[PDB]
Amino acid sequence: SVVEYEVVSKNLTSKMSHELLFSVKKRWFVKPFRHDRQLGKLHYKLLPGNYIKFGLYVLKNQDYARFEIAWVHVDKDGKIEERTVYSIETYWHIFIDIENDLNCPYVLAKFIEMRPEFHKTAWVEESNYSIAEDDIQMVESIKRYLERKI
Ligand SMILES: [Cl-]
Ligand SMILES: [Cl-]
Ligand SMILES: [Cl-]
Ligand SMILES: [Hg+2]
Ligand SMILES: [Hg+2]
Ligand code: NI
Ligand code: NI
Ligand code: NI
């Protein structure tokens, strides 16, 4: 009744790759079942259904940050299908600062805040919390905010 799924979570001297899964149904981040700080991975066991993957890819020395949103579809038979629905490039110094914005989409600030510490992975606590926006409004709010910021 669950499917295994892996994403990248690592923060190294020169680069960071920070991915997390978000449950469409629950409207909050999915809790990983295992993290691998050695290989820099997060492992999930997923019920069939729809998920959003947030991805942040940073080259620190180039002051470069790419942010992506992907739709992840998980079927009964174990089949997983992924589609990128949004991608933007900007400076790391800008993207990192979103954290401190007084008004911006909460899910995005939370995502950034949860980035992996150096040589660790990004964890996600137990929760029954859900944001108020559905997946469409949520994504649109993120795009609108980043269009302005960038
Ligand atoms: Cl290193
Ligand atoms: Cl370099
Ligand atoms: Cl799909
Ligand atoms: Hg889907
Ligand atoms: Hg904010
Ligand atoms: Ni650990
Ligand atoms: Ni399907
Ligand atoms: Ni749109």
Swiss-Prot record:
Q: Disulfide pairs?
A: none
Matching InterPro entries:
DUF3258
Q: Which domain of life is it from?
A: Viruses
Question: Which Gene3D superfamilies does this UniProt record tie to the protein?
Answer: 2.60.40.2930
Q: What is this protein called?
A: Uncharacterized protein ORF157
Q: Which organism is it from?
A: Acidianus filamentous virus 1 (isolate United States/Yellowstone)
